[PDB]
Amino acid sequence: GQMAYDRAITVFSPDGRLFQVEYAREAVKKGSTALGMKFANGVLLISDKKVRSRLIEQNSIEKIQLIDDYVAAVTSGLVADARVLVDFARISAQQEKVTYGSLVNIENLVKRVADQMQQYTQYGGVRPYGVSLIFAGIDQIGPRLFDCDPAGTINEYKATAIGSGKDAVVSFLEREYKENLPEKEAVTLGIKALKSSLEEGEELKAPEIASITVGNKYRIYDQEEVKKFL
Amino acid sequence: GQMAYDRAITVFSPDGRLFQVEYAREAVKKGSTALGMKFANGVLLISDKKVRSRLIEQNSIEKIQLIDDYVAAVTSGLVADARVLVDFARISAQQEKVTYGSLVNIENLVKRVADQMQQYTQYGGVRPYGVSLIFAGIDQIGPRLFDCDPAGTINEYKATAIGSGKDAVVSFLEREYKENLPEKEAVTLGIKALKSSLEEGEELKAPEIASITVGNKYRIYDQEEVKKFL
Amino acid sequence: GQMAYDRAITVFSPDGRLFQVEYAREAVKKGSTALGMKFANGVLLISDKKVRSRLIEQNSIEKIQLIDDYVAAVTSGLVADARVLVDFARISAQQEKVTYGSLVNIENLVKRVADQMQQYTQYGGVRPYGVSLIFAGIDQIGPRLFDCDPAGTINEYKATAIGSGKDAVVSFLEREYKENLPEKEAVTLGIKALKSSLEEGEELKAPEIASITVGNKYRIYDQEEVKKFL
Amino acid sequence: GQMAYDRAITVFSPDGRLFQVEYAREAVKKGSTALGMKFANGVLLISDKKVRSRLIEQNSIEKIQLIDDYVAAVTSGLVADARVLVDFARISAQQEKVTYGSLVNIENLVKRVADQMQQYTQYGGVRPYGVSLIFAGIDQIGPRLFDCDPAGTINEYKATAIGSGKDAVVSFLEREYKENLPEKEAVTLGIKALKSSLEEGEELKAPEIASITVGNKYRIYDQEEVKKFL
Amino acid sequence: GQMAYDRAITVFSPDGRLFQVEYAREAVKKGSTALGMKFANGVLLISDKKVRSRLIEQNSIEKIQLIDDYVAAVTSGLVADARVLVDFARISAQQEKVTYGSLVNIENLVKRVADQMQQYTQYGGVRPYGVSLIFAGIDQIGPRLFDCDPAGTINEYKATAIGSGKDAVVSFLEREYKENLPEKEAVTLGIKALKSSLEEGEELKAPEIASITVGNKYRIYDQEEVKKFL
Amino acid sequence: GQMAYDRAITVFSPDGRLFQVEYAREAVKKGSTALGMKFANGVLLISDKKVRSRLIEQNSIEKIQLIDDYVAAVTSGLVADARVLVDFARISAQQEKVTYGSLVNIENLVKRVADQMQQYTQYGGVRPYGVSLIFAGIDQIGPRLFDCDPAGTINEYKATAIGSGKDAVVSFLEREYKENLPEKEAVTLGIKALKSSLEEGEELKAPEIASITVGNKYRIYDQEEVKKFL
Amino acid sequence: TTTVGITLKDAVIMATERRVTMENFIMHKNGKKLFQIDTYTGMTIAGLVGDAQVLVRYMKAELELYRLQRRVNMPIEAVATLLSNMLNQVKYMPYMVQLLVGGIDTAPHVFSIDAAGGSVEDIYASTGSGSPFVYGVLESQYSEKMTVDEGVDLVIRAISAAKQRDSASGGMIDVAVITRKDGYVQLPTDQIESRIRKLGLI
Amino acid sequence: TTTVGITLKDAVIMATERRVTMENFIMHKNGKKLFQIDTYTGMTIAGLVGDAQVLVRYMKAELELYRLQRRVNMPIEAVATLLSNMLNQVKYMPYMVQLLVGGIDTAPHVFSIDAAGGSVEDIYASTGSGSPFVYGVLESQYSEKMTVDEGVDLVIRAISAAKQRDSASGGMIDVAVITRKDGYVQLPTDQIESRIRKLGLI
Ligand SMILES: C[C@@H](NC(=O)[C@H](Cc1ccc(O)cc1)NC(=O)OCc1ccccc1)C(=O)O
Ligand SMILES: C[C@@H](NC(=O)[C@H](Cc1ccc(O)cc1)NC(=O)OCc1ccccc1)C(=O)O
Ligand SMILES: C[C@@H](NC(=O)[C@H](Cc1ccc(O)cc1)NC(=O)OCc1ccccc1)C(=O)O
Ligand SMILES: C[C@@H](NC(=O)[C@H](Cc1ccc(O)cc1)NC(=O)OCc1ccccc1)C(=O)O
Ligand SMILES: C[C@@H](NC(=O)[C@H](Cc1ccc(O)cc1)NC(=O)OCc1ccccc1)C(=O)O
Ligand SMILES: C[C@@H](NC(=O)[C@H](Cc1ccc(O)cc1)NC(=O)OCc1ccccc1)C(=O)O
């Protein structure tokens, strides 16, 4: 039954489902866990790192990407598709700055990215992007936190997560998250949430941390500062 | 089950896999083994040679190709697709020089090549390139070493390998690689890594060696110098 | 198993094979045997002739075609596709002469032809050319000898062959070929190689012979001269 | 086995065959037999006529068509496709006259027609022409006689035939054809060849005869002259 | 066997047949019978009428259509496709008059219509017209009578028929047709031919009659004149 | 058998049928019954109304649409496709008025609509309109009444009907219709015809009535006048 | 340039001179300005040489294709109409030519066509810089009852007068006669010279 | 610029000078204006150097491809017709050149082609600013019965006269002789100098 309605993107199932979009969401769950949360006059992003062999440079596997000095993004899923979407977001942000002289709402930037992803779910001959993204930054309204799925759906969160351990992290944040926390406390809480999603075999491995506050630009935590919360 | 989701490039499997991309990676493993590693103020490339009949000229089977005087590439997989990608890289490098007057980051050149390969995995009516590439050179940041797969993924390495004996070489380099080695020592280590990947029947056959140092252009090792490490 | 991955050109097999390209190579092996070899300051081409009924004019079945006064080609496989590729090569050669005033490297001409053939193996809605070609001539580097397959692969040889008796001829040349032979000796050796590939029933039938030397243009052997080596 | 590789034009069989092209050749063998032969300073065409009911005008079923005053063609196979190809040949001939002021080689005209037919065997969404053609005329080289098949192959003959009785006619001409015969003798020989291809039930029925000599234009034999050889 | 080669227009059968074209000819045989014949300095058309309910106006079911004042056409098969082809013929006739100032040969007009129909039998994504047409008129050569089939074939007749009772009418005309008959006698003969094609149950029902003579325009027989031959 | 030739619009059945067009006609029979008839110097339209819940406004379910002040149309079948065709007819009518300054023949307007519908039955990638239409109005010839089917066929009637109860209404009109009736009598006859098509369970429910006379514009019957014939 | 075409009872006579003025001097003395474009049709050209030669090649191709498809020669008025459409379609980037078309389909015809595509049938016409001198001779001496021999002498005298007064005209006179019985016949040069000597024009 | 081409019984002789005037002064004294474009065909160029050089490359490519496809050399009149079409197709954005084409197919031919695509065959022709001086020499001294040696001396004298009166012409004279027996042969410079000394032109 299901195998008869899961071969083409533009085919609805008898119960009104799009299995090709659903299958793309399975690719997202294979990616590394990442999360973001808002705090007092700021927002931060944490991305888990799976340490590979020592032959890999520790500068290209960074999943946190700056869209500009005030907007950052983190992705999960197909790396190649994620790189294309990040490049599209950067071009879209600059187009906004050329047209109006500045960027006023981050939600508009997310919508342009999501509209691009939604287009690849309605026309034949293409496949949907197998990537989920989280956008966080500061605009003329304040700290913002958004997520985007392969289907192109947009939601705004006080705290959210993507990746393989998404369910474990969101459950942990459902119990222990507090609003308007200081930046240091928020990072400690985020480390515990990422810690509570791994298996018993492994342990936390000094992830990527980035944050921004109102009136300032994005700053990337160095390895020395990360070890302090480790 | 798998045979129902491995016929079209733009079809996701129920577990979120792209089998056509995976099958392209099988073509890569049929190619000859090649590797590259960085050393003190430089980077080198080694490509194994399978000696065919004496009727073949020993000038066209060279898998190491110069993108410019400061960037070189080596490929593995479908030869015909590899030639097209190398030509695309050379044109892309010259476009960068015309626009800005010079080449500043090699990673940008690799991204343009990878974006071309990623495009052939999302649109119907085309097949992905069955080629993996390694890019090494000197730019305004220093020695660089990149790899690219049929899916269009990009990673940066201190040392890496491609081809049939990729697993054996990377395991050997995982145990014996050292940083900031002199050029002569690095070549000797690379020969042993390539040696430790062949079967008991055959033996090493004077491969291709190329290297470059900061402030200089790429130089190709002649047969006389290769025999000295043989 | 194989029958599920051999219907479309743009489909990889589970073991990373392109069966449609492979099937095109089967059409090549149905053609008449042809070979070429380099000698002292020159290169020659020999193409076997299968004598049909006397009603056929002995001027159109010539498989050796001049690309210009200094480059010649011989083909094997589908005659109709071979004619199209030869016309494409002739146009490409003239485009080179208009742009630069002369032709410097024959290898560049072969690459343009091979790129055309490679394109017909990656896009849907078209089939690959079922033709293999051998290019021989004199350029600013010296005598050159190239071959091209339906997949678009390029190799340079001191001596090579195409067609049905390719395996027998290359084995014979693997044992008896010598470098820098005089033109008369090279033709005699080539006749024996073509002779050693036929079945016991038939015999050699005065084939086509063409050759060129440095500083001169291509000359076509007449029937009188061919009978002297017969 | 064969039924799995005979549905699409752009699909090679495992043994390197194009069955759709082969099937088009079957449509040709359903057409009426026609033949042409060269004689002393001239060339002629003979086309068998199958007499239908008396209600059909005896002016439109003529299979011999003049391309110009010096080139004529005869076709066999699908009538509708044959009409299109004849119109294409006439336009191509006039384009040659506009560009150069005259027509020098008839073989060039045949190649343009054959290239059109070859194109319809390599691209999807179209079917090959089910027509075989014979071109005969006088140019700056002398009497010419060509044939063309659905695959687009070109051959030059002293005498040839197409249609249902092609095998019988070519066998008869293989035994009794002579070169440089007078025009009257050549017509008598051609009538016997066409006669020797019919079944025992029927008999020859006053076919179409056309001929041309050097320095003159094409002339069409009238019914009175045809009865003289009947 | 047949069901494997009758789904696509651009697919040849193993015996060189185009079943989609053949199936279109079946739609033609469902139409009402119509016929035309030439007489002394003229030509006429007769089209059988199947009387439907009295609620239908007796002015739109007329199958005889004037292409201009000197050319008329009658169709059989799919009414909707027939209307499109008649409109195309009318536009084509006016294009001829604009270019040359008059219409010289009716056969040229028929060829343009047939070329349009032939095009819809060689390209995928379209279906052939299921219409057969008969063209009759006066040009600079004299009375003309042509027919056209879905395949685009053209034949010229002294008398012919189309529709369901085509076989019965042509057999009757094969026995009783005479040339250069007066107009009144020709109409009487045509009525008998149409009468001899119906079943025993029904009877002739005052059909459409149109005729034209040299030096005059087309005239449509009124019901009063039709009853005189009834 | 039938299931093998009913999947694509551009496929003929072995007996020369287009099942996709036939299936579109099934959608028409699901619509509400409507009819039109001509009377003395006028023509009227009646469309049955199926009373839904009271929450629906009684102004948008009107199936009678004015093309202009002198032409009206009523449709049956897919509502969404019907709206598109009505909009196309309105644009076509205005194009006629811009080009010539007025509308002379309504039949020309119907042909443009029918040509649009016929086009969607011959090209792949589209589906036919599942709508039947009736056009009635006054032009320079007099009262006109036309119908159009999904196949694009055009017929002119003194009285006709479309919808689910088409067969019952046309049978009733076949027995009781009279020509040149007064407007009041014609409406009473039309109500009885619509009444004689419903089932025993339900009853007539004050339908839509519109009419026009020579020299006047279209007028829509109000509910008060409809109840007088109820 | 001087071209002329006249009609008789059953014949059409066309004639031109041969002088070509390229780069403001007499560069060519034996140019060709009279062409056969069909079995019973001829054409003369005046104006830009490049434009005229292209049109001649186009007309030969169109008329030959027309004959092969419709099995009959194109009527003379249809030839003029085809030329009229071709020239008018590019009227704002036009061919800078003056054309005469003459031939036999069922009766003699001569057509004059301008650069804008205007086509007018006439009993006789003349084009080129020497045309007004020709019209003077034709107005005073042309007769519809003339024989073919008298018509040939008439066009020779008219062109000879033009050469005496128009510096852009000169060279040998080429004459063609078109009849149903004999088709398109170009008179030999020696015959033209004999007529010139007999008329006392040298 | 001064170019000339003449026809003899079985030969074609073409000759040019070498002066190139770039930026209103004599910048180059040894320019090339005579080219071999086929086995038995040559061409001379006058006008804009850039346009002329592009056309020479086009003609070499077209003629070589023609020879390879149809197995024979293109006829001389066909070469002129091809050039005529190419120039006329861009007449409103034209090549600002004057061209001479000469060669042997079955008989000697010389064609003159202008920027608008007009092509006229002639027994002899000359192009460039020095052409009127050449025509004066040819009108008084050319003979159709001349031998090849006499023809070579004739073109040398004609170009020498042009160099004495046209400031845009000068430099060494290049001469080519085309025959069926010997093909395209460019005369050596020393032989030209010997003829100049024998004729007393220095
Ligand atoms: C780095 C990134 N993940 C990754 O490393 C992803 C995980 C993944 C693998 C296979 C899939 O089919 C889907 C997703 N790997 C990935 O994108 O490369 C593997 C790949 C497999 C098939 C087609 C193309 C590429 C993350 O942690 O978000
Ligand atoms: C030189 C290069 N390898 C090679 O020589 C590759 C290896 C290969 C063969 C078949 C495959 O299907 C895939 C890869 N051969 C190759 O590209 O030519 C064989 C070929 C087979 C099928 C389609 C097109 C070409 C290397 O060593 O990297
Ligand atoms: C002259 C040339 N060979 C030939 O004569 C080739 C050999 C061949 C036949 C059938 C095939 O499917 C493939 C190759 N014949 C050929 O090209 O014509 C036969 C043909 C068959 C099917 C489709 C189109 C054409 C040679 O000797 O190289
Ligand atoms: C006049 C011409 N032959 C003919 O009359 C050909 C013979 C033929 C029939 C059916 C086929 O499938 C193929 C060929 N008939 C033909 O072209 O018309 C029949 C036809 C059948 C199917 C599709 C289109 C047309 C000849 O003698 O060459
Ligand atoms: C008036 C005209 N015939 C007719 O009335 C034709 C006969 C026909 C019916 C169904 C078919 O599949 C094919 C032909 N009817 C017709 O064209 O309308 C029925 C139709 C059926 C399926 C698709 C489109 C339209 C005639 O007598 O020639
Ligand atoms: C108002 C109009 N009829 C209607 O209300 C039509 C009747 C119909 C329903 C389903 C069908 O598949 C076809 C026709 N309904 C309708 O167009 O909406 C239902 C629908 C069903 C499937 C696809 C799109 C729309 C009428 O009375 O003419």
Author numbering:
A (entry chain E), B (entry chain D), C (entry chain C), D (entry chain B), E (entry chain A), F (entry chain G): 4 to 233
G (entry chain H), H (entry chain I): 1 to 202
What does the paper say about this structure?
Central to this system is the proteasome, a molecular machine that selectively degrades proteins. The architecture of the archaeal 20S proteasome is conserved resembling the eukaryotic 20S, but its α and β rings are homoheptameric rather than heteroheptameric.
To determine the details of how the HbYX motif induces gate-opening in the archaeal 20S proteasome, we used 20S from Thermoplasma acidophilum (T20S) and incubated it with ZYA. Additionally, we noted a lack of density in the central channel showing the N-termini pointing up in the ZYA-T20S map, compared to the WT T20S map, clearly indicating a conformation that corresponds to the open-gate state. The ZYA-T20S model also showed that the binding of ZYA to the intersubunit pocket shortens the distance between G19 on one subunit and K66 on the neighboring subunit by ~1 Å (essentially the walls of the intersubunit pocket are pulled together in the range of 1-2 Å), primarily due to a shift of K66 α carbon. Thus, the intersubunit “bridging” role ZYA plays leads to a K66 shift that promotes a rigid body rotation of the α subunits. In this T20S model, the T13 side chain occupies the space between Helices 0 and 2 and I12 is seen binding to a hydrophobic pocket created by the neighboring subunits N-termini comprising A11, I12, and V14. Simply put, I12 and T13 switch binding locations under Helix 0 to switch from the closed to the open state.
